[PDB]
């Protein structure tokens, strides 16, 4: 319940952030946000085709983050750590407080166009679900 | 006088004026210029080593003077003495020496320097006059009489046989002249106590005698400041300098500079050696502008000098043209005309008579008085006559005489008579006799 601690768990995420040195060093605030224009590599982060929809409701229990990489920001960094742990675990699948995590059917897509002719950019979408709704 | 006092006097007086003449005579002082100089940072003038010192001089003087003396001296019509004894001697010679001495004495004083003559006793003891370069000591009189200077000393260094230089000073007394050699420097030449040697200027009776004449006093430059030397000399000094300068000038005073704005060669240590070896001067790059030498001023200088020389003669102002001459114009005055140079001298010569050269005769009379008679003036024997004259031209009378003899009796005596050479008609007689005898 606590309530105090639910904040704390959020704090834990904060703890993770501090815990993760490379985040500070790496960031890499640029490109994501303007600086897209800035020369390749430029890596921007954002949701894919995200425009607000639905009202009077939470957007979703799960939070999804979309990455678009040209120049490949720390997809690798996140991927290495996440992959290692995820592979490491690998299971059980995450469950929060008896809630059913599972996302629906996943999604995959990729397309790249390079005006520059720079090697093809890739897009990675990650979705996280925490707790049942 | 104490030696110290004696010595002191000389130093004060400035040696220069007599010395300068001597030096000048030997040569003009190029040094006075002496040479072109350069200005240092100090800006004090320094003589450059490069410039040479050159001087020439004449030496004009001698030729004229000798003529002057001879002409001036003439031959006395007669000579007389106050004393019979002296007179007898004086008549006979009559006195070659006397005339010469007087003329010389007057001449010397008149002539450079002199300036000052100090009598010294001859070995003979006959008055001998010598001239020594000025020390020059300042004249002072030990004796009360300010006007006279009883004693004057001159000290000059002399080179010995060894050639070591020692100071020598001479002590002069009115009564006696002294010569001192001060090798030691401690003492003057011995003694000299007094009349004993050095000898008095003159001694009479075989005993030391004093002239009683005021002791030698330096002569200030005359207001006239005219000298026999001077007359030519003024013209001459210019003349000599100019002539001398001209010859030197052409070669000289390049002298000798070569300057080029550009361009320098190898560093001059190398440069000098190579440059000589290469020889010739070439200009490259910028000019190449004409350099100092020889350059135009060789020509220019010659031109300038030529003008200068002409002027220089004019400065002499002897005269541009050769003599007309005004006379010659052969006449009695012709002779006067004949020697322009002499004539100027002649005026001086005549001047000398005015001078008291005649006065010297009086002096002789005084001398005459001194010996005796004592008290009379035999000096003039019932007359006083002086003749330059010269009344008669030698040529004219002689020429006339020859013609005259046939017409009538001439001269023979008449030409003679003026001297008279001889009263005796006898010489005349022979000429007549021949005529009677002839033929």
């Amino acid at each position: 319940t606590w309530k105090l601690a639910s904040r704390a768990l959020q704090k834990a995420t904060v703890e993770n952030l501090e815990s993760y040195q490379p985040l500070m060093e790496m960031v890499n605030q640029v490109t994501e946000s303007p600086g897209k224009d800035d020369p390749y590599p430029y890596v921007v982060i954002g949701d894919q085709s995200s425009t607000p929809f639905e009202t009077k409701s939470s957007f979703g229990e799960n939070i999804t983050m979309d990455f678009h990489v040209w120049g490949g920001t720390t997809r690798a960094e996140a991927q290495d750590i996440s992959s290692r742990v995820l592979e490491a675990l690998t299971y059980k699948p995450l469950m929060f407080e008896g809630f059913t995590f599972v996302a629906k059917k996943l999604v995959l897509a990729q397309v790249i166009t390079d005006t520059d002719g720079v090697t093809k950019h890739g897009i990675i979408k990650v979705r996280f679900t925490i707790n049942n709704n | 006088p104490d030696t110290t006092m004696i010595q002191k006097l000389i130093d004060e007086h400035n040696p220069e004026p007599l010395l300068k003449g001597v030096r000048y005579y030997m040569c003009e002082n190029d040094i006075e210029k002496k040479r072109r100089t350069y200005y240092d940072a100090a800006g004090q003038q320094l003589v450059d080593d490069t410039k040479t010192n050159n001087r020439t001089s004449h030496a004009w003087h001698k030729l004229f003077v000798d003529q002057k003396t001879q002409y001036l001296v003439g031959e006395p019509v007669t000579f007389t003495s106050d004393n019979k004894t002296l007179l007898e001697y004086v008549n006979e010679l009559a006195d070659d020496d006397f005339d010469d001495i007087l003329n010389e004495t007057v001449k010397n004083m008149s002539n450079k320097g002199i300036e000052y003559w100090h009598p010294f006793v001859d070995e003979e003891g006959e008055f001998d006059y010598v001239i020594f370069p000025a020390e020059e000591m300042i004249v002072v009189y030990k004796d009360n009489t300010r006007r006279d200077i009883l004693f004057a000393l001159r000290y000059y260094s002399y080179k010995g046989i060894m050639g070591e230089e020692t100071q020598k000073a001479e002590l002069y007394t009115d009564t006696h002249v002294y010569y001192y050699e001060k090798i030691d420097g401690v003492y003057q030449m011995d003694y000299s106590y007094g009349e004993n040697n050095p000898r008095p200027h003159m001694t009479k009776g075989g005993q030391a005698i004093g002239w009683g004449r005021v002791p030698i006093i330096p002569f200030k430059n005359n207001e006239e400041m005219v000298s026999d030397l001077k007359f030519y000399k003024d013209l001459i000094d210019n003349y000599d300098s100019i002539t001398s300068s001209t010859m030197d000038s052409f070669s000289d005073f390049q002298q000798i500079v070569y300057v080029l704005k550009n361009y320098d060669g190898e560093n001059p240590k190398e440069f000098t050696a190579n440059l000589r070896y290469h020889s010739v001067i070439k200009v490259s790059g910028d000019g190449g502008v004409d350099t100092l030498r020889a350059e135009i001023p060789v020509d220019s200088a010659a031109k300038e000098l030529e003008r200068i020389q002409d002027e220089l003669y004019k400065s002499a102002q002897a005269v541009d043209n050769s003599p007309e001459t005004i006379g010659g114009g052969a006449t009695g005055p012709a002779l006067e005309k004949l020697y322009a140079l002499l004539d100027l001298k002649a005026n001086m010569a005549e001047r000398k008579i005015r001078a008291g050269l005649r006065l010297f005769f009086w002096f002789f009379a005084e001398y005459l008085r001194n010996t005796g008679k004592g008290d009379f003036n035999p000096d003039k024997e019932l007359t006083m006559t002086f003749t330059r004259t010269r009344i008669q031209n030698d040529s004219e009378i002689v020429q006339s005489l020859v013609q005259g003899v046939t017409g009538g009796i001439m001269s023979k005596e008449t030409a003679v008579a003026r001297n008279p050479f001889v009263q005796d008609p006898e010489e005349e007689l022979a000429r007549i006799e021949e005529e009677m005898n002839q033929y």
Binding site: - | V259, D264, N267, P268
Partner: protein, 99 residues
Amino acid sequence: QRVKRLLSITNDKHDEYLTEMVPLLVEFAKDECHNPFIDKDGNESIPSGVLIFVAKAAQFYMTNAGLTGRSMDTVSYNFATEIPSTILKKLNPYRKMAR
């Protein structure tokens, strides 16, 4: 400019380099007496003509070279050449400096 700038300037920085360079050519040729263009001490002196050229060239060169001071990459730089300063020096405006 700044002392640092002055120092940074090669010419200024190396007095010796600048000082040496001119006289090397200069010394041998000129008169060559040599017109010493030097004291007896041997302290260097520079000929008037040399001085004018040297002074201008030295000052110009450092400026021209840079750094500050160097032409802009973006376009060919009028300034560095200009106007042209090398040309300014050349045929220097009095002209054939000397007559």
